[PDB]
Design a protein around this ligand. Structure first.
Ligand SMILES: CCCCCCCCCCCCCCCCCC(=O)OC[C@H](COP(=O)([O-])OCC(O)COP(=O)([O-])OC[C@@H](COC(=O)CCCCCCCCCCCCCCCCC)OC(=O)CCCCCCCCCCCCCCCCC)OC(=O)CCCCCCCCCCCCCCCCC
Ligand SMILES: CCCCCCCCCCCCCCCCCC(=O)OC[C@H](COP(=O)([O-])OCC[N+](C)(C)C)OC(=O)CCCCCCCCCCCCCCCCC
Lengths: 90, 124, 54, 206, 37, 49, 365, 231, 108
């Protein structure tokens, strides 16, 4: 619920949504506090666009989430949450 | 000098004997020790002793036998803030600091090159 | 650089006690008495035979 | 280049981070990880080719399309000089790195000396077999130093067995069924006598 | 739990058991696929 | 008692501390193999990596 | 691949007990020239189960000797013959050693295998350097409860008819008739399907074996006959503290009764500290039992095996002189005195190491 | 291999593993001033300073016979501290000893010093013997180096450095030349070198590479068995 | 007045400081000379010897060395209070003042 919220005049790209929506169902968002989930979305997407640029290209061109992307994505989402400064106490 | 074959072991381990009938009845009670000499063999008391001061004192003795080792000793005993020479690593704090302070220093190297290449001429 | 290393001259000898020897040890223990004892009774008398003497 | 060139770099950082326990160490590990990802970020945008002839033909200002081409090509020739940077980073690394380069070396030399102690013991132990079939003075020669310790006890008249041993296991084995089960007190000498005596208003010092 | 307890009462499988190594179902699948593949 | 305790009384849940004799033997009674092993480990790992 | 090399063959039923060939796995040693070890597995038990024991870096047994994990007759891939006479089964090993060009070998065994190993030293001692027996003793075990179960299971296995019985009918038969988990697993893996899936059968001869056990007479494997004699060489025995096969109370005396050089408990006979568990017979499964067996095995191979009787250890080779009996040498002008006995190379017969070193010795002079 | 099975092995009437205050009938009891006329006791508060001066003496009186050997003075200090640190690091609760562990240990060290003042303490005679054997081996190395000759220790180091190169030139699949692998290579050389001392290397065969040495041998005519009969 | 040094008899020399700057330098040179001292360059006038790998028994060896270099006779009651570099500097001054006023060495 906190993830689906969106501000006004702020559309999101389809590929970016897949990443955020993915982290939610997998349960990784359960670690950080709810009030920090909305800002985590912005920071996570920005972190991906800079460092993980090839990942976004495959999801865009092929339009499918391959297993290689799942392992990479499944590994960075728990990692990033520990990297950024968030309230890890659920 | 001669070393033989690395693969082969000493001939003692390879040389064997076999028994036959009749057999001597006598059972050896003790090992013969006619001459009391056990030189060049280290004591077996030095078996399960934990780390202590003798480890860093003997380390310096062997390090001082090398050129690179003499530098380590002099630098460690003078330029390391430690309350003891028994160094025990249980965290990588001191190790990460030295890496971020070094790998980061080499940042801006590419942006510096871009300045020269881009300041060379104006596309227009 | 390592091959160019050298070795310092060590001391010639340490102190030699004028009243301790290997045969006449100054201090006492049961270890030296054991050596003198087994020299008296001699080493194990190993028999090469297939049956006992008795 | 793009694929597999960063797999090894991830194992090094993972082990480095797993060893971190204190929060301060975890923080510097995060900083280090960012720098690695920053330097290792891949750039793939399909640099497009420019066909100045096509633009020159359709429409363009006289002298412009040609001026852009000759000037564009000049900068394309300029490229990074990887050779120069490769040498400086290899000769001298840094100050802080030298501090731990020499610290971790002495640290390892301390624990390599202990590894050699344990190794050489198991090496000498191959010549030791059947402790129960050695003579008294031959066993003491394997464990060189016990005779010296045994002499010190005798010369100081510490002839109470196990007095200077913190764990007199031999004394516990001999008293498993003893009346008034007790072991000798630590560092007890057969000559020390701490007996006291007092006189009170009552008899027998009571 | 009740129905499970009530119901309670392969070459790669044997070779690994000889080495007394704990093997997961996933590992068994890859080894079988590795041979066939 | 001295022979048995000095060879069988140590345990892993406690620290065994070095004695005077064990200090002199390690530092001033080491053999050639011990001297070679330490320098062998030092040169390979600390110098030649 | 290289370290593991098991010769492949088909069992052949033999009318003559001398035309019997043994087959098994060979484990190559780390070093070029090492003496060989021949190890016999428990009856009806797989040789493969012992491979991780002999190929463990922690133990490092191959650093000492090359290992032949060999199957006795009527077991595994070796030839088949109804007789189980230890003298006949011992001659089989001597032919194997000849065909494989082995002058003399170290013998080992587990359980009944230990008996077979010790029997070879009793009948062929001049070509056996030592014996290492694990949870066995040279004793009549016909009336031990552990043996009866094994004797009982083998009899139940005679009821199954693979032609008519289906795969499921077999699995149900084993679980109900065989309670011991290990024996059950051992027997299952011994079942094999011949080429062309003609039918399934046991790798071991179930008929010849059951008759040996069911008859329960001197030729039975549980029995140790006085005919086997005495073993003159080095022997080391290792068995669990609480073992159904070897009871510490009285089952140690047969060792002294059969092995002349056995000194006794603590020197050549040891027990592994352990709890009461019927599975302790299989030491290779439990690390605690195995680590002790391996250490004792490496000590036997390194210092005691292939060492002259009157010498304590291998350390005494070349420095301890044995007394000589008078009028024991052909030379009449011989001054009798103490001598160090000759210890020969492990395969001096099938090599020319003596002829080669004799030449090198002349070049010195 | 073998563990003590009796769970009550470390039991005493005073508690578990109590070697500081064994239970005895005449137990310590308090004293009251108002009711105490006179007392005879030897306990005092002088053990601390006696623990300090005893160290200074045992150190200074042992250095008289070290001949200025700095490496020996520093080694002896480490050994002297191990002797004074026993009460501070032992499992025994030295602060709960029957009648004062401080006085007990100080009086014990005084008996060691008395022997040290006469240069008759077995630790002293053991240090002299150990050191002389060490310097004889170091001087042997020096005499061989001044002649440009190679020491037996350097020959091993060079032989081990080249073996590492041979073993890692074939270790391409992996690249972790563990300390375990480096060790077994050195031990294998040591075992062959150890056996070489008693049986030196005559030919290309190497140290202890002759089978004929292990054939039947006899004592020389000039050195027969002096201790027993031969036949 | 002679002592063995690496097997050779050498005449021992005694020092007379009588100046504050010379004392601070001697103690540091003394403490830096001890093989147990850590962070020898991090050692200053306000350095706690405990922070440099030194215990009560090491302060004795240091005091024993002060007697060798200066000729003092330090009592056992004074040694256990020397736990900082500042302490050696002030004790050395107190001894020089005592001998300059009382004309004799302090009670040993
Ligand atoms: C003018 C003419 C006059 C002179 C004529 C010339 C005649 C001279 C006579 C010389 C004869 C030849 C000498 C040969 C050697 C000595 C004799 C001998 O048997 O040695 C082999 C005999 C064992 O033979 P072995 O096969 O070579 O040993 C194999 C195993 O190692 C052994 O141990 P194991 O357990 O592994 O194996 C089995 C073991 C099992 O049996 C035993 O081991 C025996 C157990 C004894 C030890 C138990 C503890 C007691 C000893 C404690 C020590 C106390 C004495 C020292 C303390 C005081 C200090 C002096 O041995 C046996 O098989 C049975 C024992 C032999 C048969 C019984 C013999 C009994 C008498 C022997 C002792 C003498 C007692 C004093 C009598 C003299 C009276 C003044 O050695 C001994 O056991 C001890 C020998 C000591 C004998 C001293 C007396 C010498 C005089 C001999 C005369 C004949 C005896 C007269 C006594 C008659 C009483 C009935
Ligand atoms: C032949 C060679 C010569 C041999 C010489 C003598 C060998 C002596 C062997 C050692 C045993 C000595 C006995 C000491 C008593 C030990 C038992 C004990 O402490 O009591 C605890 C006992 C037993 O406690 P317990 O708990 O340990 O055992 C209980 C026993 N069960 C389990 C059966 C209930 O309890 C007490 O507290 C009783 C206290 C009174 C003890 C009486 C001691 C009298 C002797 C002391 C004076 C001797 C000095 C002589 C000096 C002569 C000078 C010239």
């Amino acid at each position: 619920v906190e993830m689906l919220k969106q501000n006004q005049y702020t559309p999101m790209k389809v590929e970016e949504q897949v990443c955020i929506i993915f982290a939610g169902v997998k349960g990784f968002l359960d670690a950080l506090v709810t009030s920090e989930v909305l800002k985590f979305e912005k920071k996570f997407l920005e972190h991906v666009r800079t460092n993980h640029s090839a990942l976004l290209k495959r999801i865009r061109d092929s339009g499918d989430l391959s297993e290689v992307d799942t392992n990479e994505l499944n590994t960075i989402i728990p990692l990033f949450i520990q990297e950024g400064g968030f309230k890890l106490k659920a | 000098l001669q070393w033989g074959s690395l693969a082969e072991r000493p001939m003692v381990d390879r040389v064997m004997s076999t028994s036959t009938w009749p057999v001597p009845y006598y059972q050896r009670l003790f090992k013969a020790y006619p001459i009391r000499e056990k030189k060049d063999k280290m004591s077996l008391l030095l078996s399960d002793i934990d780390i202590d001061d003798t480890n860093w004192y003997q380390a310096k003795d062997f390090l001082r036998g090398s050129f690179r080792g003499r530098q380590i000793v002099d630098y460690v005993e003078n330029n390391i803030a430690s309350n003891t020479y028994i160094l025990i690593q249980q965290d990588v704090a001191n190790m990460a600091k030295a890496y971020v302070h070094d790998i980061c220093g080499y940042i801006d190297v590419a942006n510096k090159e871009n300045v020269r290449i881009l300041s060379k001429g104006d596309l227009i | 650089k390592e091959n160019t290393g050298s070795m310092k001259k060590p001391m010639a000898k340490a102190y030699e006690h004028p009243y301790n020897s290997e045969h006449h040890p100054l201090n006492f223990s049961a270890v030296k008495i054991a050596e003198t004892f087994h020299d008296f009774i001699g080493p194990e008398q190993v028999s090469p035979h297939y049956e006992s003497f008795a | 280049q793009a694929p597999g060139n960063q797999d090894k770099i991830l194992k090094w950082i993972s082990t480095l981070s797993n060893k971190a326990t204190t929060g301060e160490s975890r923080s510097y590990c995060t900083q280090l990880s960012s720098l690695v990802s920053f330097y290792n970020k891949q750039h793939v945008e399909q640099i497009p080719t420019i066909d100045f002839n096509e633009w020159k033909s359709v429409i363009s200002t006289q002298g412009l399309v040609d001026k852009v081409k000759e000037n564009y090509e000049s900068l394309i020739k300029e490229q990074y000089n990887t050779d120069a940077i490769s040498k400086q980073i290899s000769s001298a690394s840094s100050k802080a790195l030298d501090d731990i380069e020499n610290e971790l070396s002495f640290h390892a030399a301390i624990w390599l000396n202990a590894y050699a102690d344990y190794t050489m013991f198991l090496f000498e132990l191959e010549e030791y077999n059947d402790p129960n079939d050695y003579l008294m003075h031959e066993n003491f020669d394997f464990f060189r130093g016990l005779e010296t310790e045994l002499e010190e006890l005798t010369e100081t008249h510490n002839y109470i067995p196990g007095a200077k041993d913190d764990v007199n296991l031999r004394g516990y084995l001999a008293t498993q069924f003893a009346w008034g089960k007790k072991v000798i007190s630590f560092y007890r000498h057969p000559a020390d006598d701490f007996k006291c005596a007092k006189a009170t208003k009552n008899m027998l010092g009571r | 739990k009740r129905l499970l307890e009530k119901l309670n009462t392969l070459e790669v499988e044997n070779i690994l058991k000889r080495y007394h190594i704990n093997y997961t179902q996933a590992l068994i699948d890859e080894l079988v696929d590795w041979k066939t593949g | 008692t001295h022979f048995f305790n000095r060879r069988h009384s140590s345990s892993q849940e406690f620290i065994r501390f070095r004695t005077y004799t064990e200090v002199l033997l390690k530092i001033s009674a080491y053999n050639d193999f011990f001297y070679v092993l330490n320098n062998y480990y030092y040169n390979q790992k600390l110098i030649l990596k | 691949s290289r370290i593991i090399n098991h010769l492949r063959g088909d069992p052949v039923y033999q009318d003559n007990t001398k035309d019997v060939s043994l087959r098994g796995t060979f484990l190559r040693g780390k070093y070029d020239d090492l003496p060989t070890m021949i190890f016999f597995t428990e009856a009806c038990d797989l040789t493969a189960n012992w491979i991780p024991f002999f190929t463990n870096p922690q133990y490092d047994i191959l650093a000492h000797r090359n290992v032949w994990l060999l199957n006795p007759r009527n077991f595994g891939n070796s030839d088949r013959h109804p007789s189980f006479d230890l003298q006949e089964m011992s001659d089989d090993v001597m032919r194997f050693m000849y065909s494989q060009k082995i002058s003399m070998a170290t013998l080992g065994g587990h359980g009944i295998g230990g008996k077979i190993a010790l029997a070879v030293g009793c009948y062929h001692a001049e070509r056996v350097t030592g014996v290492f027996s694990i949870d066995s003793s040279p004793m009549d075990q016909r009336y031990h409860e552990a043996f009866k179960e094994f004797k009982g299971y083998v009899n139940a296995l005679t009821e199954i008819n693979f032609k008519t019985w289906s795969d499921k009918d077999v699995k149900v038969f084993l679980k109900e008739n065989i309670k011991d988990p290990k024996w059950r697993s051992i027997f299952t893996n011994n079942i094999s399907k011949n080429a062309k899936t003609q039918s399934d059968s046991f790798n071991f001869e179930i008929n010849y074996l059951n008759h040996n056990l069911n008859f329960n007479k001197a030729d039975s494997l549980g029995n140790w006959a006085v005919k086997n004699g005495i073993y003159t060489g080095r022997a080391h025995f290792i068995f669990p503290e609480y073992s159904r096969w070897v009871h510490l109370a009285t089952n140690t005396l047969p060792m002294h009764k059969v092995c002349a050089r056995v000194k006794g408990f603590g020197h050549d006979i040891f027990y592994v500290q352990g709890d009461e568990n019927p599975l302790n017979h299989w030491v290779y499964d439990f690390e605690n039992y195995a680590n002790v067996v391996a250490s004792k095995l490496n000590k036997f191979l390194h210092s005691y095996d292939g060492v002259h009787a009157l010498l304590k250890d291998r350390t005494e080779i070349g420095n301890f002189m044995i007394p000589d009996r008078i009028k024991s040498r052909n030379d009449s002008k011989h001054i009798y005195g103490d001598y160090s006995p000759a210890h020969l190379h492990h395969n001096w017969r099938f090599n020319h190491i003596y002829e080669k070193h004799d030449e090198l010795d002349k070049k010195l002079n | 291999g073998y563990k003590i099975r009796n769970k009550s092995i470390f039991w005493t009437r005073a508690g578990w593993k109590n070697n500081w205050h064994p239970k005895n009938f005449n137990a310590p009891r308090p004293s009251y001033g108002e009711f105490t006329m006179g007392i005879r006791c030897r306990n005092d508060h002088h053990s601390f300073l006696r623990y300090v001066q005893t160290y200074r003496n045992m150190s200074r009186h042992c250095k008289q016979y070290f001949l200025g050997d700095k490496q020996l003075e520093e080694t002896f200090i480490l050994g002297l501290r191990s002797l004074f640190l026993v009460p501070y690091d032992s499992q025994c609760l030295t602060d709960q000893i029957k009648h004062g562990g401080e006085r007990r240990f100080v009086d014990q060290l005084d008996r060691d010093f008395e022997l040290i003042s006469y240069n008759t303490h077995p630790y002293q005679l053991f240090t002299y013997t150990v050191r002389n054997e060490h310097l004889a081996w170091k001087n042997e190395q020096y005499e061989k180096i001044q002649k440009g000759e190679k020491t037996f220790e350097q020959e091993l180091l060079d032989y081990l450095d080249e073996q590492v190169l041979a073993e890692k030139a074939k270790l391409r699949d992996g690249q972790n030349f563990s300390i375990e692998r480096m060790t077994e290579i050195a031990l294998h050389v040591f075992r062959k070198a150890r056996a070489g001392k008693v049986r030196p290397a005559q030919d290309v065969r190497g140290p202890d590479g002759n089978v004929n040495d292990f054939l039947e041998q006899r004592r020389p005519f000039e050195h027969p068995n002096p201790t027993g009969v031969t036949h | 007045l002679t002592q063995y040094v690496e097997g050779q008899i050498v005449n021992r020399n005694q020092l007379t400081l009588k100046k504050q700057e010379d004392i601070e330098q001697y103690v540091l040179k003394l403490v830096r000379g001890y093989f147990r001292t850590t962070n020898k360059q991090g050692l200053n006038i306000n350095s706690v010897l405990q922070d440099h790998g030194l215990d009560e028994f090491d302060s004795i060896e240091l005091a024993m060395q002060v007697e060798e270099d200066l000729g003092y006779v330090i009592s056992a009651e004074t040694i256990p209070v020397l736990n900082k570099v500042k302490h050696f500097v002030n004790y050395i001054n107190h001894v020089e003042q005592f001998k300059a006023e009382n004309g004799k060495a302090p009670i040993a």
